Amino acid sequence: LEPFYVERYSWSQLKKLLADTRKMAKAPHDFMFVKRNDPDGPHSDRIYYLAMSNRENTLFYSEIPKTINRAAVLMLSWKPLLDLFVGIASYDYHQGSGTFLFQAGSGIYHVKDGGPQGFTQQPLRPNLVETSCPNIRMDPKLCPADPDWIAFIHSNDIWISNIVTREERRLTYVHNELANMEEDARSAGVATFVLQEEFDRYSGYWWCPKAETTPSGGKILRILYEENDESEVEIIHVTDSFRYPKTGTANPKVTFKMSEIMIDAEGRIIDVIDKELIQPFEILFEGVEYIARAGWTPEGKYAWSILLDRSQTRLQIVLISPELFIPVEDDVMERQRLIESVPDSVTPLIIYEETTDIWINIHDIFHVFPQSHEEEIEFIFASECKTGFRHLYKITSILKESKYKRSSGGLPAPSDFKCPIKEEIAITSGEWEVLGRHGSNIQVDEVRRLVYFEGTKDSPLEHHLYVVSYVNPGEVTRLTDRGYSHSCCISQHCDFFISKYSNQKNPHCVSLYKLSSPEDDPTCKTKEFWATILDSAGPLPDYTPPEIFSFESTTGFTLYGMLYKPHDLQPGKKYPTVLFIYGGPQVQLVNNRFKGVKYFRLNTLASLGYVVVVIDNRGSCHRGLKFEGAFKYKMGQIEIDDQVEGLQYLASRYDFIDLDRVGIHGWSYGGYLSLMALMQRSDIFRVAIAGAPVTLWIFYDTGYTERYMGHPDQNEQGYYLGSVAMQAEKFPSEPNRLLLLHGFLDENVHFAHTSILLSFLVRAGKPYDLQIYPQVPESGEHYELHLLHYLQENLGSRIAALKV
Amino acid sequence: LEPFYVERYSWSQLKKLLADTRKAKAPHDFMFVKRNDPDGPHSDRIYYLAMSNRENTLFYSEIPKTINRAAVLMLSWKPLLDLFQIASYDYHQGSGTFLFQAGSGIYHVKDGGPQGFTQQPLRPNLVETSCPNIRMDPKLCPADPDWIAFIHSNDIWISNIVTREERRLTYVHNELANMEEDARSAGVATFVLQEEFDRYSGYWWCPKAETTPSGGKILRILYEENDESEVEIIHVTDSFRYPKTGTANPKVTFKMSEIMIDAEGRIIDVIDKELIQPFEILFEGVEYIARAGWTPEGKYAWSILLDRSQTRLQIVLISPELFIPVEDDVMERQRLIESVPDSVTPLIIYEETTDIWINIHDIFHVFPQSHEEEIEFIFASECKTGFRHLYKITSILKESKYKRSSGGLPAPSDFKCPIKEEIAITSGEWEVLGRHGSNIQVDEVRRLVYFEGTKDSPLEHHLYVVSYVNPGEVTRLTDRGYSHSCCISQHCDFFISKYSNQKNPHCVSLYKLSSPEDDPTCKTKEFWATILDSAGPLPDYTPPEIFSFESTTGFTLYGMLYKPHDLQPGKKYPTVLFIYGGPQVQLVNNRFKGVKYFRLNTLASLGYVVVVIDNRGSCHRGLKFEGAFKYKMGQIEIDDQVEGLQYLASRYDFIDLDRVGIHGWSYGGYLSLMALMQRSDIFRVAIAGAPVTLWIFYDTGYTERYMGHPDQNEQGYYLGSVAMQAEKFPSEPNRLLLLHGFLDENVHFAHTSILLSFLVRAGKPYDLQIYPQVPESGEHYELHLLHYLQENLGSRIAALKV
Ligand SMILES: *C(=O)C1(C(=O)Nc2cccc(CN3CCN(Cc4ccc(Br)cc4)CC3)c2)CCOCC1
Ligand SMILES: *C(=O)C1(C(=O)Nc2cccc(CN3CCN(Cc4ccc(Br)cc4)CC3)c2)CCOCC1
């Protein structure tokens, strides 16, 4: 078997090759369906959505016709909703009023469409909400109970503002803008760094969906909101500064407040009353580090929250009555009578609790039914805690008065607020997961008593949409077609769904499907294609898709991989191999989706003469908790076995794979594994290129690290064995084998990781290559040029093998 | 001619080679104290600082009245201090008090005063404090050695070492405050003055106490007070005030603490005094306080003041009568301003200009005042002939035409003093040295001045003496064949020389000075004793050859040549040019290069020709030679380097002109980048360590001296800033390697960072090594550099690789 040698391009030639082959718009999303209710007209529904038509991500609408010509294919045209001469990330809407609300740059704007006002046939001028606030307003939201009222965040404080009356009032005085960050670490209504980065919770305030009428003929509006104290939280610097909770250090001090807003009959503010918890957060919610999720019951009787312990191994869904909140009062005497005024019946309610020896994966599935009985609550939730696969469970929990009495002056026991479980029915089950993250949610038809959900049942390589009864769960009907991964949205009216779908051969597509029922059984569901929203571009002419492969592993699981065969393959000749790797939690690289946009350059590599290989090792997602839990406390210790195992699977089954000439490359967790690879399996991997790698888990945040690696105090040996900075001595003593790439201003994986590795590589007298991108298209081009040139001169080419 | 290829070693082999080949401060800050004991054997005790891996500390040696002139006396080092349960020191002849900082503490001891001479180590006595933070820059009051001053959290404090009384004199800085919020300091020299003018202290004791009626006294401290509020701020892995070229330097003034002491040495009172008119009014156009002190009797403070362009120097006398108590009360203040007579004016005793630049030095000697309207002093200047010579000046202290009471502002020449006389003491195509320890010692009895100079050669420093009265015969006291660094005893009967040459490691020796009985002004020297024996020629080290070549520019240029060891006939070798090439430095001279530049030898042992050349701009060749790159930094240095390379090559067939690398640090890293950028044909690889890449990112004091304000020099700043010219770099990799420390506070990493941005944006390849924070860093550097040169310049694979 002869070794193949890649063309040795000059730097100038490689640059040109890359510029020619290079020669990604946000596909429509945030769909909403509004009925036309016009019997004489041709359209059942208008859909609104966000999309890029190098453009503003903006609002569009399309017309859903009552009938189609089933001989032809209908392509909906995109009608601009706004009169435009930055972007719109998200929008808010109120059905009764037809009020849209959204941020675009510095301005909060609003418009009406689809309400009592009727339906525009032309773009609307966005109406700016006037403000006196110096700085940018963030995270605006319509009050669902009065669309004249919005809320927003200015300088880490909650404000409300009336789009009719022009009235603007600050609700919280927790922070002053002209201040030092060491001086002021307090914020209200804003989710802190760890909750954004590690739990994907972006908002920290929640309009109560219902009014309460005042006897005068006015009303009370309400805002549940998280208030955070970051005083005790590590501060770090980047070429400004922010509060980063390093693993094993302090997370922010947290609590629930409730802003109660009295409005008169003319819609002017009478008074604002900031309320606090009757007993400090730490008493009422023992053991709870993070507020993962919060909102309200549909009628606003209770607020709810999903609460986690620091070790993220215990989850509690808790009901919080507005009555548990008493005004913020200076005088002890006056304050003392308020606490007596609160009855002992008004206690917190833990409607659900679960635990695992692995970890809770937080998700966006939680549906509450209307309350049929004061003493009960009925809800759908998803959990891996029963079977080790995320499944939907319909639960009834009893709102028993607690044993604990505040009047007595004692402290509450652990299980004092636990609620009995009347009913806990599994709606789904199997060796596959319900998806509850990154847009994946459920839709509940309360009339037909059905629930639409996305899942891995047909294959862990493809997402499909499914329906099932939550009343007598059995048959799970798949609604999307096989041979594609789907990302779906269901109309609130549950008579339509939209799928964004693709596969390795074909670019993403967006289609609309009409849902029907046979007249004899409403619970049974069929789908018919209705219209295209976004036509697939079509197979890329210059792009050759990889083949998906699998192999039963010695670890007892199937492992899936992608193999990019060298273009123009020669017989008898063995080729140099590049392993591209992520291999960390919460991510799957290997699935039936178009990889031609993001991983187009794995194709470019194949074109130069490299075998390219990707493998989802254990710890990767869409394979259930047991498969994910394999590296718990042992990050870095197993992933490279699985990668090597798969590489030897392929090498015995194909002989164009030259095992003497394997390179590995990855960003973030991949950068980490690329370093671990050269360190542990020096005999397999000739070169390792580490992009922005984790090199020292003690330099990484609480929410992520402690979930997978525990508190460092109780896992020094795992933290040590998983930290490449601490094991510098194990790298090769010959150069041209280790390449480090890092953004200087990285705020997720600090440059700190790369510098601390560099000081330890120097102490250990080890060689290294480094590249830095100090601030942007120009950086990307330099990366790809440097990567291809490094692989050529140090792996692929003639001169590379001479160099040893 | 068949090309030599260096043995291709592995990383682990090279690391081992460096480690095998790898297998302490010389006596300094000397002082001579007379024994004054007729029956005893010794004339003098000498105190000095030295290490014998060890703490730098105080030692003394015994100078014998006589020696056996057949033998060689090695002085033995007696430790003066007892180990505690030192970088500098102060001394007070009359009392024999030593004062010095050792770690966090200020200690003191007595030797050689009335209390006599110890025969054993003394126990350092701690100066007790209530101050939370570390005390800096302790100094004895020359008027009363019970009192010291020191700096604490950027304010001046005093402390009596007998009474233990402690008092803060200035209230300018709040320690517990944001560094951006509080930017005032007192008695402390700011970044640019330490870093670009080597002034380290910001306050000066008046050397005399004025007696009061009560039997008490008044002690005086002149101090600088700085406001750094408008100065740019930069942050490193805290933050500090860095004046970027063309931006604001600190706001500066003179202040004076009057300290009333009673007859038992208790502080009665402390009065803070400010200039009667602001600094900007009294000293028009002055930006920098370069130097300051007192006249020997304490009648005047003195100062050497520079303009922003560093082309005007003034020496100014400042009477204490010029300061008034700080009074926020308008009525009181006006009354105080009226009470100070118009006859009391700053006296500019000297003023000079140049179209090149002023070079600040440490030479300034004031003679005892013999008349009230005359001051007699010795200064040094390049401004008359373009070489630094000593001038004896007498200036007339007339009453000024400006009268404060007329409510006007003074005109630019109102404070200028007539020059009664200006006499050259030295002259010639050579310079008096006045920096890095070089100064004069004036003998006021025999009317002679000892000084250091390049008179005999630009490659050797020598000690010289000459009369300052009928200047003529300059006598060389040090011996030819060595570069010397010297200190003269205050009694002027001895001198010490730390000397070396290319072949021999540094040595320190004591010489006795004598006069023939018939002429005290004639001076001879006799060897007396060795203070530190030379290690002897290094066994493993092979000294380079000093060469020179007559440049087309019309100057002799000097270089050093390391011939490749075990030289083969008919074979040509790869050449490493090592470079600094910048102002204020000379790499090529007759000194031992076996410590600092030992690795240039290692290179030659591996089969590399090594070249070093002092291009124009380098020092010790006078102001005209230095002035070559005025406004044009980066545009001429590499021509000289290449001229000397081409010269060596057309004389030696063993230089492979097709395989030249260049390497340096700082200015040398700059020129290494400039080299590959302008002379791509000559240089295969540039290794740039801590390069300046953007002249607007460097400081005021240095950059504006050599390049002026950026507005006056758009083209020089552009052409001299390599980061502005990233597109002129090679498109082929393994030619450019950058080395930087992330924490550099002189050449910020920012220079490397901005360069990388433009290299990326221009699609250019580069290599990078970083030292994040320590002897392990140096070893890795040496290891990466030798291996890099092997792989990419001098080995067989290197030739193949192209
Ligand atoms: C890690 O999580 C994180 C990071 O991912 N950083 C990062 C930096 C730079 C680029 C990317 C995107 N990535 C997309 C896939 N490409 C594959 C590839 C391209 C080109 C070639 Br020639 C081969 C393979 C690589 C680049 C991601 C993000 C969070 O913060 C820390 C850094
Ligand atoms: C520039 O002025 C400055 C600087 O000099 N930095 C610096 C950093 C690290 C080391 C040195 C010491 N330098 C001594 C001379 N060596 C000669 C040599 C050694 C080894 C080999 Br293999 C060849 C030649 C080189 C290193 C100096 C200091 C001021 O601030 C900016 C950085």
PDB file of C-alpha atoms in Angstrom, chain A residues 521-671:
ATOM      1  CA  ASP A 521     -62.131   9.629  15.244  1.00  0.00           C
ATOM      2  CA  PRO A 522     -60.926  13.154  16.232  1.00  0.00           C
ATOM      3  CA  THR A 523     -57.914  11.642  18.146  1.00  0.00           C
ATOM      4  CA  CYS A 524     -56.458  10.163  14.897  1.00  0.00           C
ATOM      5  CA  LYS A 525     -54.399  12.670  12.809  1.00  0.00           C
ATOM      6  CA  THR A 526     -53.284  12.923   9.134  1.00  0.00           C
ATOM      7  CA  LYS A 527     -51.038  15.513   7.426  1.00  0.00           C
ATOM      8  CA  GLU A 528     -51.230  16.904   3.871  1.00  0.00           C
ATOM      9  CA  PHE A 529     -48.588  19.140   2.197  1.00  0.00           C
ATOM     10  CA  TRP A 530     -50.071  22.673   1.725  1.00  0.00           C
ATOM     11  CA  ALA A 531     -47.271  25.079   0.599  1.00  0.00           C
ATOM     12  CA  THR A 532     -43.511  25.817   0.527  1.00  0.00           C
ATOM     13  CA  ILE A 533     -42.324  28.814   2.667  1.00  0.00           C
ATOM     14  CA  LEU A 534     -38.609  28.535   1.633  1.00  0.00           C
ATOM     15  CA  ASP A 535     -37.467  26.483  -1.364  1.00  0.00           C
ATOM     16  CA  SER A 536     -34.327  24.387  -0.793  1.00  0.00           C
ATOM     17  CA  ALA A 537     -31.433  25.979  -2.744  1.00  0.00           C
ATOM     18  CA  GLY A 538     -30.786  22.432  -4.125  1.00  0.00           C
ATOM     19  CA  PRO A 539     -27.705  20.138  -3.835  1.00  0.00           C
ATOM     20  CA  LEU A 540     -24.456  22.185  -3.846  1.00  0.00           C
ATOM     21  CA  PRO A 541     -22.559  21.378  -7.112  1.00  0.00           C
ATOM     22  CA  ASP A 542     -19.103  21.731  -5.443  1.00  0.00           C
ATOM     23  CA  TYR A 543     -20.078  19.728  -2.286  1.00  0.00           C
ATOM     24  CA  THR A 544     -19.766  15.925  -1.775  1.00  0.00           C
ATOM     25  CA  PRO A 545     -21.750  14.790   1.453  1.00  0.00           C
ATOM     26  CA  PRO A 546     -20.042  12.280   3.806  1.00  0.00           C
ATOM     27  CA  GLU A 547     -21.542   8.803   4.411  1.00  0.00           C
ATOM     28  CA  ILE A 548     -22.943   8.068   7.892  1.00  0.00           C
ATOM     29  CA  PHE A 549     -21.418   4.877   9.414  1.00  0.00           C
ATOM     30  CA  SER A 550     -21.898   3.044  12.785  1.00  0.00           C
ATOM     31  CA  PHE A 551     -20.119   0.256  14.755  1.00  0.00           C
ATOM     32  CA  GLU A 552     -21.064  -1.744  17.880  1.00  0.00           C
ATOM     33  CA  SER A 553     -18.524  -0.566  20.520  1.00  0.00           C
ATOM     34  CA  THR A 554     -16.766  -2.585  23.276  1.00  0.00           C
ATOM     35  CA  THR A 555     -18.550  -0.112  25.689  1.00  0.00           C
ATOM     36  CA  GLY A 556     -21.877  -1.780  24.735  1.00  0.00           C
ATOM     37  CA  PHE A 557     -23.394   0.985  22.543  1.00  0.00           C
ATOM     38  CA  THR A 558     -23.777   1.771  18.852  1.00  0.00           C
ATOM     39  CA  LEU A 559     -21.505   4.766  17.968  1.00  0.00           C
ATOM     40  CA  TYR A 560     -22.323   6.906  14.867  1.00  0.00           C
ATOM     41  CA  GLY A 561     -19.733   8.588  12.599  1.00  0.00           C
ATOM     42  CA  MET A 562     -19.392  10.578   9.367  1.00  0.00           C
ATOM     43  CA  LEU A 563     -16.717   9.561   6.826  1.00  0.00           C
ATOM     44  CA  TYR A 564     -15.650  12.081   4.121  1.00  0.00           C
ATOM     45  CA  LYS A 565     -13.977   9.865   1.438  1.00  0.00           C
ATOM     46  CA  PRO A 566     -10.984  11.432  -0.391  1.00  0.00           C
ATOM     47  CA  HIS A 567     -12.167  12.866  -3.741  1.00  0.00           C
ATOM     48  CA  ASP A 568     -10.702  11.112  -6.859  1.00  0.00           C
ATOM     49  CA  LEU A 569      -9.767   8.036  -4.675  1.00  0.00           C
ATOM     50  CA  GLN A 570      -6.826   5.987  -6.173  1.00  0.00           C
ATOM     51  CA  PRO A 571      -6.609   2.155  -5.709  1.00  0.00           C
ATOM     52  CA  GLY A 572      -3.518   0.771  -3.810  1.00  0.00           C
ATOM     53  CA  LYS A 573      -2.786   4.272  -2.288  1.00  0.00           C
ATOM     54  CA  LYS A 574      -3.302   5.011   1.511  1.00  0.00           C
ATOM     55  CA  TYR A 575      -4.288   8.630   2.459  1.00  0.00           C
ATOM     56  CA  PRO A 576      -3.670  10.969   5.444  1.00  0.00           C
ATOM     57  CA  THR A 577      -6.635  11.237   7.885  1.00  0.00           C
ATOM     58  CA  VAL A 578      -8.139  14.249   9.787  1.00  0.00           C
ATOM     59  CA  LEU A 579     -10.409  13.557  12.794  1.00  0.00           C
ATOM     60  CA  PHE A 580     -12.684  16.584  13.358  1.00  0.00           C
ATOM     61  CA  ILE A 581     -13.974  16.516  16.965  1.00  0.00           C
ATOM     62  CA  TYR A 582     -16.273  18.289  19.387  1.00  0.00           C
ATOM     63  CA  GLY A 583     -17.126  15.256  21.621  1.00  0.00           C
ATOM     64  CA  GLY A 584     -18.546  17.260  24.599  1.00  0.00           C
ATOM     65  CA  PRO A 585     -21.970  17.293  26.288  1.00  0.00           C
ATOM     66  CA  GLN A 586     -25.217  18.858  24.891  1.00  0.00           C
ATOM     67  CA  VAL A 587     -24.032  18.382  21.239  1.00  0.00           C
ATOM     68  CA  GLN A 588     -24.385  15.810  18.413  1.00  0.00           C
ATOM     69  CA  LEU A 589     -22.249  16.322  15.245  1.00  0.00           C
ATOM     70  CA  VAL A 590     -23.438  13.064  13.554  1.00  0.00           C
ATOM     71  CA  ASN A 591     -27.032  13.090  12.237  1.00  0.00           C
ATOM     72  CA  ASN A 592     -28.996  13.178   8.940  1.00  0.00           C
ATOM     73  CA  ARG A 593     -28.751  16.973   8.301  1.00  0.00           C
ATOM     74  CA  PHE A 594     -27.131  19.166   5.639  1.00  0.00           C
ATOM     75  CA  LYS A 595     -23.493  19.690   6.797  1.00  0.00           C
ATOM     76  CA  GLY A 596     -22.586  21.526   3.585  1.00  0.00           C
ATOM     77  CA  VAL A 597     -22.829  25.054   5.085  1.00  0.00           C
ATOM     78  CA  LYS A 598     -21.094  24.811   8.517  1.00  0.00           C
ATOM     79  CA  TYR A 599     -18.702  21.858   7.676  1.00  0.00           C
ATOM     80  CA  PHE A 600     -18.172  22.745   3.980  1.00  0.00           C
ATOM     81  CA  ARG A 601     -14.372  22.764   4.616  1.00  0.00           C
ATOM     82  CA  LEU A 602     -14.346  19.053   5.671  1.00  0.00           C
ATOM     83  CA  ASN A 603     -15.311  18.677   1.972  1.00  0.00           C
ATOM     84  CA  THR A 604     -12.480  21.061   0.886  1.00  0.00           C
ATOM     85  CA  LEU A 605     -10.105  18.832   2.975  1.00  0.00           C
ATOM     86  CA  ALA A 606     -11.436  15.623   1.235  1.00  0.00           C
ATOM     87  CA  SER A 607     -10.817  17.469  -2.102  1.00  0.00           C
ATOM     88  CA  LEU A 608      -7.042  17.953  -1.242  1.00  0.00           C
ATOM     89  CA  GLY A 609      -6.603  14.196  -0.381  1.00  0.00           C
ATOM     90  CA  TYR A 610      -7.469  13.833   3.359  1.00  0.00           C
ATOM     91  CA  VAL A 611      -9.810  11.198   4.800  1.00  0.00           C
ATOM     92  CA  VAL A 612     -12.030  13.262   7.153  1.00  0.00           C
ATOM     93  CA  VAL A 613     -13.716  11.477  10.093  1.00  0.00           C
ATOM     94  CA  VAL A 614     -16.185  12.655  12.781  1.00  0.00           C
ATOM     95  CA  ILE A 615     -17.427  10.391  15.636  1.00  0.00           C
ATOM     96  CA  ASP A 616     -20.001  11.200  18.402  1.00  0.00           C
ATOM     97  CA  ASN A 617     -18.198   9.528  21.398  1.00  0.00           C
ATOM     98  CA  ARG A 618     -20.044   8.810  24.688  1.00  0.00           C
ATOM     99  CA  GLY A 619     -21.182  12.015  26.490  1.00  0.00           C
ATOM    100  CA  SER A 620     -22.673  13.360  23.198  1.00  0.00           C
ATOM    101  CA  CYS A 621     -26.537  13.950  23.219  1.00  0.00           C
ATOM    102  CA  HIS A 622     -29.716  12.417  21.619  1.00  0.00           C
ATOM    103  CA  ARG A 623     -28.728   8.965  23.069  1.00  0.00           C
ATOM    104  CA  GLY A 624     -30.425   9.125  26.546  1.00  0.00           C
ATOM    105  CA  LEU A 625     -28.979   9.891  30.048  1.00  0.00           C
ATOM    106  CA  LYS A 626     -27.001   6.598  30.539  1.00  0.00           C
ATOM    107  CA  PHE A 627     -24.997   7.265  27.313  1.00  0.00           C
ATOM    108  CA  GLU A 628     -24.513  10.931  28.367  1.00  0.00           C
ATOM    109  CA  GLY A 629     -23.522   9.981  32.011  1.00  0.00           C
ATOM    110  CA  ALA A 630     -20.499   7.818  30.932  1.00  0.00           C
ATOM    111  CA  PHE A 631     -17.917  10.653  31.604  1.00  0.00           C
ATOM    112  CA  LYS A 632     -19.531  11.970  34.835  1.00  0.00           C
ATOM    113  CA  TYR A 633     -16.505  12.951  37.084  1.00  0.00           C
ATOM    114  CA  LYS A 634     -14.194  11.546  34.272  1.00  0.00           C
ATOM    115  CA  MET A 635     -14.263  14.306  31.557  1.00  0.00           C
ATOM    116  CA  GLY A 636     -11.256  13.758  29.193  1.00  0.00           C
ATOM    117  CA  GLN A 637     -10.643  10.116  30.284  1.00  0.00           C
ATOM    118  CA  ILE A 638     -13.004   8.135  27.904  1.00  0.00           C
ATOM    119  CA  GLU A 639     -13.702  10.297  24.792  1.00  0.00           C
ATOM    120  CA  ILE A 640     -10.400   9.436  22.985  1.00  0.00           C
ATOM    121  CA  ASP A 641     -10.923   5.602  23.421  1.00  0.00           C
ATOM    122  CA  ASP A 642     -14.277   5.946  21.508  1.00  0.00           C
ATOM    123  CA  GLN A 643     -12.563   8.120  18.803  1.00  0.00           C
ATOM    124  CA  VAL A 644      -9.613   5.689  18.398  1.00  0.00           C
ATOM    125  CA  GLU A 645     -12.012   2.638  18.480  1.00  0.00           C
ATOM    126  CA  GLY A 646     -13.998   4.168  15.560  1.00  0.00           C
ATOM    127  CA  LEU A 647     -10.782   5.017  13.694  1.00  0.00           C
ATOM    128  CA  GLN A 648      -9.545   1.373  13.939  1.00  0.00           C
ATOM    129  CA  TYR A 649     -13.098   0.166  12.961  1.00  0.00           C
ATOM    130  CA  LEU A 650     -12.743   2.220   9.707  1.00  0.00           C
ATOM    131  CA  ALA A 651      -9.029   1.295   9.119  1.00  0.00           C
ATOM    132  CA  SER A 652      -9.664  -2.523   9.085  1.00  0.00           C
ATOM    133  CA  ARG A 653     -12.794  -1.934   6.867  1.00  0.00           C
ATOM    134  CA  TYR A 654     -11.019   0.567   4.468  1.00  0.00           C
ATOM    135  CA  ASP A 655      -7.267   0.535   3.611  1.00  0.00           C
ATOM    136  CA  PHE A 656      -7.158   4.028   1.965  1.00  0.00           C
ATOM    137  CA  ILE A 657      -6.913   5.105   5.706  1.00  0.00           C
ATOM    138  CA  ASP A 658      -3.154   5.569   6.544  1.00  0.00           C
ATOM    139  CA  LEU A 659      -3.050   5.192  10.405  1.00  0.00           C
ATOM    140  CA  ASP A 660       0.623   6.440  10.426  1.00  0.00           C
ATOM    141  CA  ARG A 661      -0.627   9.950   9.404  1.00  0.00           C
ATOM    142  CA  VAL A 662      -3.678  10.922  11.585  1.00  0.00           C
ATOM    143  CA  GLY A 663      -4.343  14.587  12.567  1.00  0.00           C
ATOM    144  CA  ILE A 664      -7.065  15.758  15.041  1.00  0.00           C
ATOM    145  CA  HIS A 665      -8.745  19.250  15.183  1.00  0.00           C
ATOM    146  CA  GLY A 666     -11.614  20.803  17.204  1.00  0.00           C
ATOM    147  CA  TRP A 667     -12.848  24.033  18.895  1.00  0.00           C
ATOM    148  CA  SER A 668     -13.778  24.401  22.591  1.00  0.00           C
ATOM    149  CA  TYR A 669     -14.439  20.895  24.010  1.00  0.00           C
ATOM    150  CA  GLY A 670     -12.938  19.722  20.683  1.00  0.00           C
ATOM    151  CA  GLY A 671      -9.825  21.848  21.280  1.00  0.00           C
TER     152      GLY A 671
END
